[PDB]
Amino acid sequence: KVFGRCELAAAMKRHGLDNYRGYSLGNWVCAAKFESNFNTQATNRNTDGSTDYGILQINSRWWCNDGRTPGSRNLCNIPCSALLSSDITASVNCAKKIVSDGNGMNAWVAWRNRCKGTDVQAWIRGCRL
Numbered sequence: 001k002v003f004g005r006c007e008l009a010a011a012m013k014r015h016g017l018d019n020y021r022g023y024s025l026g027n028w029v030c031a032a033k034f035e036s037n038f039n040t041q042a043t044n045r046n047t048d049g050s051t052d053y054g055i056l057q058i059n060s061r062w063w064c065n066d067g068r069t070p071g072s073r074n075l076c077n078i079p080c081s082a083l084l085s086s087d088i089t090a091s092v093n094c095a096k097k098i099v100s101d102g103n104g105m106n107a108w109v110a111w112r113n114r115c116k117g118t119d120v121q122a123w124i125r126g127c128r129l
């Protein structure tokens, strides 16, 4: 599913991601835009043989099982395919674990390079949340 911006913002808010660990909703929407273009089915292979999955491009090295990242962990306790669903619940729940974990939203490279330090409220402007 390719979410619209305000659609995604509403779903993230409903699932408690807004202000989670102090990161306002616009941070999460901006991250999703630049990680996946709002597309739940996005996948991208990393140099190390892991893959990033879903609207927040969550990695199989640590967070989900894809059966093809030998030696990896599955800290979200999910198949990586769960991160591709039209329902973002699994992505949100796993993102909550990631962002609690040490570097906060710097875990998401596109957030660090394209969202951090910017007017992120722009990403929810105009929405009825």
Ligand SMILES: C[C@@H](O)CN1CCN(CC(=O)O)CCN(CC(=O)O)CCN(CC(=O)O)CC1
Binding pocket: 062, 100, 101, 102, 103
């Ligand atoms: C901030 C870093 O710690 C992030 N981290 C980088 C890699 N770490 C480095 C280390 O933990 O020294 C090694 C593996 N790490 C072991 C562990 O955490 O117990 C599991 C994955 N972690 C879980 C987490 O950290 O919440 C996510 C990625």
Ligand SMILES: C[C@@H](O)CN1CCN(CC(=O)O)CCN(CC(=O)O)CCN(CC(=O)O)CC1
Binding pocket: 101, 102
């Ligand atoms: C193996 C190293 O990770 C040891 N570690 C070195 C420093 N870590 C590095 C990191 O976690 O990336 C940073 C702080 N660390 C965060 C965490 O782990 O959750 C908590 C303390 N850790 C607990 C543990 O790791 O079992 C002991 C020391």
Ligand SMILES: [Cl-]
Binding pocket: 003, 004, 005, 006, 007, 008
């Ligand atoms: Cl929308």
Ligand SMILES: [Cl-]
Binding pocket: 024, 025, 026, 027, 120, 121, 122, 124
């Ligand atoms: Cl915001």
Ligand SMILES: [Cl-]
Binding pocket: 065, 066, 067, 068, 069, 070, 071, 072
């Ligand atoms: Cl694996």
Ligand SMILES: [Cl-]
Binding pocket: 073, 074, 075
């Ligand atoms: Cl594990």
Ligand SMILES: [Cl-]
Binding pocket: 021, 022, 103, 104, 105
């Ligand atoms: Cl933080």
Ligand SMILES: [Cl-]
Binding pocket: 059, 062, 098, 107
């Ligand atoms: Cl990570």
Ligand SMILES: [Gd]
Binding pocket: none
């Ligand atoms: Gd770690």
Ligand code: NA
Binding pocket: 060, 061, 062, 063, 064, 065, 066, 069, 072, 073, 074
């Ligand atoms: Na894994």
